[PDB]
Design a protein around this motif. Structure first.
Motif, mmCIF file in Angstrom:
data_model
loop_
_atom_site.group_PDB
_atom_site.id
_atom_site.type_symbol
_atom_site.label_atom_id
_atom_site.label_comp_id
_atom_site.label_asym_id
_atom_site.label_seq_id
_atom_site.Cartn_x
_atom_site.Cartn_y
_atom_site.Cartn_z
ATOM 1 N N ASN A 119 76.726 -80.442 22.418
ATOM 2 C CA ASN A 119 76.133 -79.848 23.124
ATOM 3 C C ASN A 119 76.996 -78.956 24.218
ATOM 4 N N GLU A 120 78.258 -79.636 24.700
ATOM 5 C CA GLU A 120 79.098 -79.113 25.432
ATOM 6 C C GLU A 120 80.374 -78.965 24.641
ATOM 7 N N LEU A 121 80.929 -79.837 23.875
ATOM 8 C CA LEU A 121 81.989 -79.297 22.847
ATOM 9 C C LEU A 121 81.113 -78.580 21.560
ATOM 10 N N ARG A 122 79.758 -79.193 21.375
ATOM 11 C CA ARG A 122 79.130 -78.645 20.451
ATOM 12 C C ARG A 122 79.854 -77.992 19.249
ATOM 13 N N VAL A 123 80.723 -79.236 18.882
ATOM 14 C CA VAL A 123 81.828 -78.757 17.967
ATOM 15 C C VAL A 123 81.816 -79.994 17.020
ATOM 16 N N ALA A 124 82.412 -79.695 15.819
ATOM 17 C CA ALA A 124 82.643 -80.629 14.754
ATOM 18 C C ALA A 124 83.961 -81.521 14.942
ATOM 19 N N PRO A 125 83.724 -82.768 15.106
ATOM 20 C CA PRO A 125 84.978 -83.570 15.117
ATOM 21 C C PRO A 125 86.001 -83.331 13.983
ATOM 22 N N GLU A 126 85.431 -83.188 12.791
ATOM 23 C CA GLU A 126 85.948 -83.333 11.527
ATOM 24 C C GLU A 126 87.206 -82.462 11.370
ATOM 25 N N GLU A 127 87.187 -81.225 12.067
ATOM 26 C CA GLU A 127 88.187 -80.268 11.750
ATOM 27 C C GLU A 127 89.210 -80.154 12.816
ATOM 28 N N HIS A 128 88.897 -80.747 14.345
ATOM 29 C CA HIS A 128 89.655 -80.502 15.271
ATOM 30 C C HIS A 128 90.504 -81.775 15.692
ATOM 31 N N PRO A 129 91.736 -81.994 15.720
ATOM 32 C CA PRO A 129 92.173 -83.279 16.031
ATOM 33 C C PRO A 129 92.043 -83.682 17.375
ATOM 34 N N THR A 150 88.414 -95.895 17.252
ATOM 35 C CA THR A 150 89.297 -95.175 16.403
ATOM 36 C C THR A 150 88.526 -95.071 15.057
ATOM 37 N N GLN A 151 88.256 -96.091 14.394
ATOM 38 C CA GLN A 151 87.707 -96.018 13.234
ATOM 39 C C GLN A 151 86.316 -94.916 13.320
ATOM 40 N N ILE A 152 85.204 -95.599 14.193
ATOM 41 C CA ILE A 152 84.048 -94.938 14.196
ATOM 42 C C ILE A 152 84.281 -93.480 14.714
ATOM 43 N N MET A 153 85.343 -93.065 15.296
ATOM 44 C CA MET A 153 85.701 -91.715 15.546
ATOM 45 C C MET A 153 85.924 -90.889 14.303
ATOM 46 N N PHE A 154 86.827 -91.605 13.122
ATOM 47 C CA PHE A 154 86.875 -91.211 11.942
ATOM 48 C C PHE A 154 85.461 -90.893 11.533
ATOM 49 N N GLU A 155 84.865 -92.008 11.238
ATOM 50 C CA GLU A 155 83.688 -91.897 10.485
ATOM 51 C C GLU A 155 82.491 -91.007 10.814
ATOM 52 N N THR A 156 81.771 -91.354 12.027
ATOM 53 C CA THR A 156 80.929 -90.679 12.683
ATOM 54 C C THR A 156 81.592 -89.205 13.061
ATOM 55 N N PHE A 157 82.957 -89.129 12.982
ATOM 56 C CA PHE A 157 83.700 -87.829 13.446
ATOM 57 C C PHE A 157 84.419 -87.208 12.542
ATOM 58 N N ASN A 158 84.999 -87.867 11.606
ATOM 59 C CA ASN A 158 86.006 -87.361 10.726
ATOM 60 C C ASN A 158 86.783 -86.032 11.081
ATOM 61 N N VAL A 159 87.117 -86.361 12.470
ATOM 62 C CA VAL A 159 88.127 -85.274 12.944
ATOM 63 C C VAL A 159 89.224 -85.201 12.046
ATOM 64 N N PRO A 160 89.962 -84.073 12.123
ATOM 65 C CA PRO A 160 91.244 -83.948 11.027
ATOM 66 C C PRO A 160 92.132 -85.249 11.197
ATOM 67 N N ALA A 161 92.153 -85.670 12.543
ATOM 68 C CA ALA A 161 93.178 -86.977 12.926
ATOM 69 C C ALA A 161 92.779 -87.152 14.192
ATOM 70 N N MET A 162 92.779 -88.446 14.734
ATOM 71 C CA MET A 162 92.739 -88.614 16.257
ATOM 72 C C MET A 162 94.213 -88.950 16.676
ATOM 73 N N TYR A 163 94.166 -89.458 18.019
ATOM 74 C CA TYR A 163 95.541 -89.969 18.586
ATOM 75 C C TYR A 163 95.318 -90.754 19.872
ATOM 76 N N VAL A 164 95.448 -91.655 20.353
ATOM 77 C CA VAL A 164 95.229 -92.102 21.806
ATOM 78 C C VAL A 164 96.425 -92.016 22.433
ATOM 79 N N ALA A 165 96.386 -92.062 23.773
ATOM 80 C CA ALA A 165 97.221 -92.042 24.777
ATOM 81 C C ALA A 165 96.797 -92.565 26.109
#
Lengths: 39, 375, 375, 39, 375
Positions: C92-102, C120-135
């Protein structure tokens, strides 16, 4: 043991040597019982 | 209403002050070294609501009343606190006049002198005991060891030193402290459990946690394979009733609390484990004292009561010591009282009353007297 | 429809989740971390009446819809809430696919691991972002500080830590949290104003009050003379339009809300003010880091945006610090975004993509991977 | 300043040292603008 | 880009490695002989955060980075440490190729040969200097004395020997070391001040303390009357700014640190004071060398820079020497450099290049060459 009689007849302070010689690291204890007697 | 007197074997066990008499067998005094402040003051009819009866009651008043050690770091920051601490002792649990019973004084090294100076005089004036006398807690345990040769590892109420000794003969040069206190372990415990899903900061919250350590927290000899064990070992994976009534769950901590005494990394301390403190001390010791140590590797300090304590002690010394020599650490179960015990001995050592701190001796030499040729 | 990707600088500012991209300059996402429940259900024709579109609309639905943080205490009690929170974001505001943006992940310390595991995992599955990372949010601001040496005081969206640091070098041991949240101040405000003649409990009632703080509530450097000032100072004696249309009148509160961060007595908290948290931290710091601090006394946290913030900071540290040393607290106006900014930096730090949480890496090591040698 | 040229010619990561040496606590920012360029 | 070469007067002053060239006048190299380890690793963007740039920067990194001498006891426990130490030298402060500049080597006696063996070859290979050459630090100062007859007292960077000499003629039999190092005094200082009310253990804490000695700590000729002086002498009773910003207070220590070099009792050392080491040496010397000594009683060693150094030297020798003979200890202010100076001389001694350690000579005889008829 004789540590009893030896220490009673040990030299007055060197019950140190006799107690700790005959394994009595509780010369501490030997005197503390002797003190519950003499305390 | 009796014969001459009984010296006053008073022992401020680094966490609790404790005491009996000369020749006594059990310190009839044992209790926390804290002071306690309530916050709110609900306007409450009547009185009896002491600000500062910590002694052994205040923990009844835990929560509202806060916590205060005067010797916090084995360092008396304040005294009147400790003063009425004594009075509490002498008049509620000692419930006894100082003025007529001698006392030996328990102290660890590293104390700037005036600490004892002040404690001494005030003990005379407020106390007028027949005479006092101080003695290093360390040394006190030492005789409490009775293995007059060899070091003792004093990691006790909250204290830590190495005490190389040799038929009474100890080298202060080789002698050391480890700032670690079971309180410290307490700390890292709070760190972990809290961050691990817990909100555990409060004074008596610290109370519960210290209880936790002293009842359940342990250490396993090994770590890394022990670590893998932790990786799934369900047996350890045990929750303990939080004294709220919750059952705090417990795993790897129960041991990952204390063990850092060998690796302050976890406390982040620049220092080094207790063991190699022992070992560098011993190496400082003469060439062949070392076997003396090995037979005399006396641990001291109940909070260290945990499992394996020696288990490691020996294993690492091994890891460092020449197998040529045969090691043996020494640690009675009763290490808390040990120090008290040996103090009861020395003070109770009739052939020794010459040492006690007489009112007069002070008087002529004030407190400064205490220092040379006496303590 | 472009080149490789832009990492997803997503920041759940303790009160609002916010985000932009790597190299971005303004978190294009900003909005409340609440969930909202209506009560009554007037039987209403048609639909479009979401239970839980809180995101940034629900406050439009304030009143009927209630309030829910999942991270309530910087503690995600629930996730699907936060899950669709994300989706809202990304769609909606990101209105963007996680799967392709880290994306780098914002977190404060003290979190039991599985929180991140699951996220983390759920971010991958629901999100399939290219890859995540926490900080760590804390660390994120830290680089957001760029004064790699010195502590930072992170009292932000609703958070509070001290972040001693030294050319990137921070001591977790000395590092701490203050449970205080601008929400907390909110609380005492409700307490006071309500008891003071007001009936102010409702969720968006809390909304108004937080608005009140962040627009008008302040603190004066001093208190007691400041108190006398309050005793008659008419200037402060200003009523503000209650967004009903009422004009809520305001006096001593406007400042007597926040200041208790130095005296939880008012929150009754056993804790201690932020300042001396800083100071005991610093004393924990090495001997002469302290001047480093003094130049690096970086505040962080917009809700702390109030007056005098440093004014006190310095005055009390003074009151505690040796004038020998020269202090300087550091607090940009833009402290909310700062954390976002530094995260945008790090993630945007091209020389650093090696760190991001790859789907696979997780896959082989599941989530537990995340922990060692990575976060 | 030369911080521009120095950092462009700074050692690749130690733009850390150079930026924060020349007052640029926003090495953060130095790179973030360099990233709006290279982002 | 010049004529033949300049030998490389490289001097690892027992505490600091230092150096210039042949014919140089000031060792352009001077800096700590330590290695430094950080602990925590705050996850820090980017790099440049060396583990081990101690050289002369690391003390900038003091605290986080720990301390490591390789020659700790004038005993190189490790070399690669010292290896890159050299490289640091030759490439940052020497910033110079070894391969083309000769160098003389500074060493104290008592070294098992392989130390030099290894240092030598590796200096050729890693360094390919045109040729090297070693020389006893002791002897180096000796010529640095130029009073070719008489002993020199070398208590320097951290070293201690007596160097009886006689127009270049020295008796190793009479020659001795005193394990004492200004580091040692450092030690007892920590002992005292800490126990005296201070908590002073940390590496750079040792840094401050050594600074303290070398700036303020002294000795008074006498002790016991000097002791009474101490008993109330307020002038000494001076607090110095602790480089945290604290002002460490100072009294009797400032002198009660070093003086024990005459009474290791305080270090508890079985050894004997420096003076009577001198005296038993001299008595070992031939019958009437002794007056030679008396004119040649050359002290050496800057850390000994303290007051009265000779003051005692003479007074006690007096106390021991026959007043028949007239004593004169010899100690330039510039005793640190003296050793460097005389080395610069010898190496710079053109009539002497025959001695330098040639790559080849080694090559044919490996390192073992170094030993007979050469060093």
């Amino acid at each position: 043991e004789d540590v009893w009689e030896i220490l009673r007849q040990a030299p007055p302070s060197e019950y140190e040597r006799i107690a700790f010689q005959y394994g009595v690291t509780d010369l501490r204890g030997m005197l503390k019982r002797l003190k519950g007697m003499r305390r | 209403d009796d014969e001459e007197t009984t010296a006053l074997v008073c022992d401020n066990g680094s966490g609790l002050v404790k005491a009996g008499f000369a020749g006594d067998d059990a310190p009839r005094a044992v209790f926390p070294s804290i002071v306690g402040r309530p916050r709110h003051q609900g306007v409450m009819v009547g009185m009896g609501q002491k600000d500062s009866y910590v002694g052994d009651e205040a923990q009844s008043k835990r929560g509202i009343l806060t916590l205060k050690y005067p010797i916090e770091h084995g360092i008396i920051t304040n005294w009147d606190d400790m003063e009425k601490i004594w009075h509490h002792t002498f008049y509620n649990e000692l419930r006894v006049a100082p003025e007529e019973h001698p006392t030996l004084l328990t102290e660890a090294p590293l104390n700037p002198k005036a600490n004892r100076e002040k404690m001494t005089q005030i003990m005379f004036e407020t106390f007028n005991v027949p005479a006092m006398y101080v003695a290093i807690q360390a040394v006190l345990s030492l005789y409490a060891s009775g293995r007059t040769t060899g070091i003792v590892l004093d990691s006790g109420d909250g204290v830590t030193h190495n005490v190389p000794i040799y038929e009474g003969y100890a080298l202060p040069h080789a002698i050391m402290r480890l700032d670690l206190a079971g309180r410290d372990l307490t700390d890292y415990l709070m760190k972990i459990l809290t961050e691990r899903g817990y909100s555990f900061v409060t004074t008596a919250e610290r109370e519960i946690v210290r209880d936790i350590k002293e009842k359940l927290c342990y250490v396993a000899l090994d770590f890394e394979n022990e670590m893998a064990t932790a990786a799934s070992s369900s047996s350890l994976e045990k929750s303990y009733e939080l004294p709220d009534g919750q059952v705090i769950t417990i795993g790897n901590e129960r041991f990952r609390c204390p063990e850092t005494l060998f690796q302050p990394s976890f406390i982040g301390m620049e220092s080094a484990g207790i063991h190699e403190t022992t070992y560098n001390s011993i190496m400082k010791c003469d060439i062949d004292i070392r076997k003396d140590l090995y037979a005399n590797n006396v641990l001291s300090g109940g909070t260290t009561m945990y499992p394996g304590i020696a288990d490691r002690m020996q294993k690492e010394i091994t890891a460092l010591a020449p197998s040529t020599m045969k090691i043996k650490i020494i640690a009675p179960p009763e290490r808390k009282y040990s120090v008290w015990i040996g103090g009861s001995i020395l003070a109770s050592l009739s052939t020794f009353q010459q040492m006690w701190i007489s009112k007069q001796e002070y008087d002529e030499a004030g407190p400064s007297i205490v220092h040379r040729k006496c303590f």
